[PDB]
Amino acid sequence: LRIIWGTNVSIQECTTNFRNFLMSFKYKFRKILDEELYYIKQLNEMRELGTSNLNLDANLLAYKQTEDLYHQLLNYPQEVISIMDQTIKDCMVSLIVDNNLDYDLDEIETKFYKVRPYNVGSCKGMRELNPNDIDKLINLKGLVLRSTPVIPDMKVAFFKCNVCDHTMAVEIDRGVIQEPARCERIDCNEPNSMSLIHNRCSFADKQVIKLQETPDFVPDGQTPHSISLCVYDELVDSCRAGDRIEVTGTFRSKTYVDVVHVKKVSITDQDLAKIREVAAREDLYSLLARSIAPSIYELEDVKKGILLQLFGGTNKTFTKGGRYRGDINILLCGDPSTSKSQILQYVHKITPRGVYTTAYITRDVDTKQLVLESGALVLSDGGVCCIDEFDKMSDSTRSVLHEVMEQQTISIAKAGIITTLNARSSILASANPIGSRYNPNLPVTENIDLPPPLLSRFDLVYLVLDKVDEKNDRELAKHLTNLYLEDKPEHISQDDVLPVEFLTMYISYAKEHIHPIITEAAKTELVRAYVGMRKTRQLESMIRLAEAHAKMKLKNVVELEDVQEAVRLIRSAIKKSVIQRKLQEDLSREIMNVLKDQASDSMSFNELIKQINEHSQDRVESSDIQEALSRLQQEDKVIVLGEGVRRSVR
């Protein structure tokens, strides 16, 4: 029983249980947290292309035999990585000796293999990193801002006796390089001074990288932090400024994190069954729009737009030179003193990335490199970004939002830097109608003092005007005092409203599991929806709107009815007649003629709908036909007699 001082890790016992887990593991986490030999196939696959790296999922937690290994590697990673390098080589040579093979032992005897563990739980950034968590594994999610040029560190070093020329290679050991004093060979026995040569010595690459951290949860009063992480060999120039990066390594102490792995790429069954059962209902399209904000009012178009705005859409790209993102940039205008700021805060409390307001490249002289240093939109290269008081904003800063409207790029051309870079999220801007607060005697394009070029490129505008009257604002005051009726809203659960935790899980599952295609079948209704605004930015906005309609309700194929409402959306977002009486009159005359011309009067309403509307073009309002038949019910011309047969008077 070998016990290291201050360590509860035995070598041979952990070696045997690591080998027992490695020779036998077939998706046990899918059973207790089809295939066969989950680790034998990957290890037998990686040995031919030369990749010495092994990505390990800390599967070690759900396994029956290795629960004592996962609770041993979180406190001491430096010892377990060093003994894992020996055990992986031992189990690989045990795999070599089991089968017939060629000369592969000539290179694996001196080759080294390592392990990169990354599947660990989340933490609260650097704020939860107390001094009891030093030399432990930790994970940080955020964005990197500055990458120092790789610096060569000397793993080895050459020494030459300048008078007799015999060479000596020395290596590193905890940060010291012993410099030999005098020659020792037999040809140069004399005592003389050696010389260090470096242009012939291998160097470990080292690099310090600035990282802007952002956890899943942030405490009240906390500001974003800039952590200086440091990468080493075989991982240099793989992480650079501009990406949402999950990183993991060992927290050291000024404090830093020594990275063991980077991640440049990125629920239960009963919850998935509840999601599938709640996704089959018809009123889900309004249910969500009611459950997104139950403390306010209806706002169907506005709440439906912010719901599908956070649903996102479809972001498809080409192989080398093309990209497109399902995105909508929204603007709000109209009457003041309503829920606008509420929304502007609520969404900041929903997204994990966003600022309540662009970044800028800088030639950092210390490291001679083009770092980036930011916040606002730049930080939210994912999620949403909230801007209030759009009309009071200056004209010099409107040119950067003119590029992020549909191009999602930053083009800086200044002293020291000419760089175009990635910058796509979506804006949510609240504006005001100049001093007008909207006027009915002026057009919409002049009342808000907003330029036409920059507003036609806007994907969605919202007239959130009040237009105060009766039997509306009375319900507004009643709903605002209904939670003042009781001192505590414990009675908020008996209504059709989904909870927040179920809603974000359904939204996160739908955003990462559905890639809907826009078929050619919805072509005909799109053309005519475009010409009504024409009698390309609106078309690009409505296809992202239609694919977001397809993103909801668990659909992989877009449908013909889904664009109808989308257009109604953009037609309602910007907004008893005598002609309606004439419409009802000719509809009553036409329905009396087509109900009395045939012999078989026993014919229902659905057969009537498919027999009078298919010989002509698009759908007329069925509620007007219901009002016309109710008018004939009052004049005793037709008899309803149930929903299965519609017959006239005798």
Place this chain on the structure above:
Amino acid sequence: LEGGALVLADNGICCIDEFDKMDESDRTAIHEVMEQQTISISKAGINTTLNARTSILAAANPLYGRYNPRLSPLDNINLPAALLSRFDILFLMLDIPSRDDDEKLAEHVTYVHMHNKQPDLDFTPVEPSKMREYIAYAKTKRPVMSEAVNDYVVQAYIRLRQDSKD
């Protein structure tokens, strides 16, 4: 952080003297803490939010110094609709010259300029510590509205909206 004056006075009274003598940069930051009490700044230094509570007290004068009865109050006040729409209480402290009521103001200023004592009424002026303690004791109270006051509130709001709704 080095806030102008909204940051050292976090929880309290923030007052503005000569409100119409300011500019648009002051108004855009005053309206932001007037609506939502959480200034947010996103500049090359930081992109952060400072939260403070400030019961904005404002003192202003019209366009021509005094009032004008031939002018409308929307034209007499140079502030826009979103500014005073957020302002729930606006006090039109207008002076009107009279024969009887001006003598009491004159008697009161000559009485306080004659000596530091207040007029001989059957009431004693309370010192700052006692009502400061009363304000600190009353601030922990959380009142809950009833239903009989709810039916009066919604009817008065409906009547006020219809009367206000030129």
